[PDB]
Design a binder for this molecule. Sequence first.
Ligand SMILES: CN(C)CCOc1ccc(-c2cc(C(N)=O)c(NC(N)=O)s2)cc1
Length: 279
Amino acid sequence: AVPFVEDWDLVQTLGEGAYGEVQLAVNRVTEEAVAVKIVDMKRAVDCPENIKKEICINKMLNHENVVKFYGHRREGNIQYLFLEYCSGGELFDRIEPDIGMPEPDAQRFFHQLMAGVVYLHGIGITHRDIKPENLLLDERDNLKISDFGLATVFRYNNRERLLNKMCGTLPYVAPELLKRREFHAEPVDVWSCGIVLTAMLAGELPWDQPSDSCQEYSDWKEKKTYLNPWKKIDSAPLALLHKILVENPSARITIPDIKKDRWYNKPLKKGAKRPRVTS
Ligand SMILES: CN(C)CCOc1ccc(-c2cc(C(N)=O)c(NC(N)=O)s2)cc1
């Protein structure tokens, strides 16, 4: 009934890339801020199919640590995806090069990342490109898993589908994607979460890619943790990383066991500061 309430002004570019762009949209009437992913379907032959899959997966998602999907509008060859706006930006920009961040902050973000990944895996979705660029933060520094353009179904009608598509981002990708024809979905996401944890605690990525040809990866398998980035990481979280960054995906720690890890459960981080006064 209220005129103008479906009008949104696009006021700022939030991100850009080959896929298209993300704009900050502000409602003309209510001033509600949302993110709008704008995709030109003529930019590639199979974009219509790709974006349709992304939209289908987005419609499945309802969790506090996953970017919420509000809907989409098509206008000719342009698709507009309306998404939860995360005003804290990328987790990437909270990681100080060569330093990382305070361990308690890293632990809190890691808890929230695990919550989001448990949720996705529970509904049979794998993200396939977990990295700090795809982990956004709201106004209270709550982590939100973002961008389902590479996501897929790995479990349907209680039957698991093995994956074979080589995809993701090399520094974050699990070794089995480079070594094996087929692989289970869930350990691949666990691995990339481990690389994210490494980055948060050390402010550096451990290797270009997880291959024996890569000396830093070989050093890790030889347990040379007196070298960086591992030297910078305290013994408790390093013990968790030793369980996550395991080459054999069948021996790799699962999420239910990550949740029982000593460091994962160590009291470290105070709740957000709240106003007080003394008398
Ligand atoms: C703390 N900082 C210095 C000030 C804010 O900076 C921002 C805020 C939001 C974003 C954002 C980038 C993207 C994206 N690439 O998809 C967003 N998407 C979303 N669903 O909200 S928000 C990027 C940068």
